[PDB]
Amino acid sequence: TCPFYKKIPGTGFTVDAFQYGVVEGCTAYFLTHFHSDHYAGLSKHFTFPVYCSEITGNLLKNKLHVQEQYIHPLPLDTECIVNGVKVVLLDANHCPGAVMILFYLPNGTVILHTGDFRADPSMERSLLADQKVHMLYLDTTYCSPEYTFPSQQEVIRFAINTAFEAVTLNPHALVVCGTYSIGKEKVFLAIADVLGSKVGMSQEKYKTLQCLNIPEINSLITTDMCSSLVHLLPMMQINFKGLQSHLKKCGGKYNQILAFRPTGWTHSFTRIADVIPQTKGNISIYGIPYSEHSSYLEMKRFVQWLKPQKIIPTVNVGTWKSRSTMEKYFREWKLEAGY
Ligand SMILES: C[C@H](Cc1nc(NCc2ccco2)nc2ccc(Cl)cc12)C(=O)NO
Ligand SMILES: C[C@H](Cc1nc(NCc2ccco2)nc2ccc(Cl)cc12)C(=O)NO
Ligand SMILES: [Zn+2]
Ligand SMILES: [Zn+2]
């Protein structure tokens, strides 16, 4: 059964609702981005129109093998008409191809669905500007004040400096980055750039990256592993056992592994410059707080600027405590800002 926060009232639209079979009355299924908690259910057998970004559409076609006739890519920042309703897709500053969706309902109501997003002041100068929003479907992943993490730029600075120093001190070190979903590509791309290397990865991950419209991607990535000194591995292999196993593979070409795990928020107190790795012998593992979701302060600033009349959270909605906590913050933001 489809939850209410995945339905757009007054329309036949759903958002990120693919695991509920045929949704009654749904004439168009929107997919905000290609993350498994959002596309769950989509396959080559789906026979309804899917609306999404071009990049999401590339991934649906190539990775899930959804039939081309059902994939409806839309350009960003462009007023489009879907089933008689004006819609706009906006960059969500999440992962590649991730969008927010503006729905202009026939009765005059305007709904913004953020999908997953990392709120940024640059969004205050999109089609959102001076646009009255009556309903906001908000990515509330980190809607609590203890959720602080650095900017992505600060985290990348730390990663680049850490890797460059280690490989300059030891030209025989290998850098490993953990990955599962799309997103956070800047971690491995920026490290490989400072090391003058391409990023080596499996065929499956290479295929995924080829769908992302990344400029000059063929100059940056490869499936030739031992010709690269930055390797991608599944996130579950980023441990001492899995990295010890990987060090054998390259045939004694490397004698040290520096690995990066680009987590979300963790309870770690410490500043970005003072992050230290887990080390066992010649293997060190850095957990870096590279987030593609809003910090609390980023979320608060975005909502207080947008001044929506009603907020519908789309994350952390499963407990009375979580729902009550988020509503208390929404009220605090509204009282402080005056809307
Ligand atoms: C990598 C996967 C996907 C995943 N699952 C969950 N929990 C839900 C869950 C666990 C098992 C099935 O469904 N939370 C995640 C949080 C961040 C990220 Cl990146 C991925 C997450 C995983 O961890 N388990 O399958
Ligand atoms: C890439 C993530 C994948 C993901 N993240 C989350 N929480 C947000 C979170 C925690 C740590 C990093 O990011 N929860 C999931 C639960 C189930 C599954 Cl399968 C995937 C999940 C995303 O942005 N997905 O949209
Ligand atoms: Zn996501
Ligand atoms: Zn998500």
From Swiss-Prot:
Transmembrane segments: none
Subcellular location field: Nucleus
Tissues expressing this chain: Expressed in brain, heart, kidney, liver, pancreas, placenta and skeletal muscle.
Coiled coil: none
Domain of life of the source: Eukaryota
Induction: During mitosis. The mRNA encoding this protein contains an internal ribosome entry site (IRES) in its 5'-UTR. This 5'-UTR generally suppresses translation while specifically promoting expression during mitosis, when cap-dependent translation may be impaired.
Subunit architecture: Binds constitutively to TP53BP1. Binds CDC27, which is itself a component of the anaphase promoting complex (APC). Binds PIAS1.
Protein task: May be required for DNA interstrand cross-link repair. Also required for checkpoint mediated cell cycle arrest in early prophase in response to mitotic spindle poisons. Possesses beta-lactamase activity, catalyzing the hydrolysis of penicillin G and nitrocefin. Exhibits no activity towards other beta-lactam antibiotic classes including cephalosporins (cefotaxime) and carbapenems (imipenem).
Family, similarity comment: Belongs to the DNA repair metallo-beta-lactamase (DRMBL) family.
Name of protein: DNA cross-link repair 1A protein
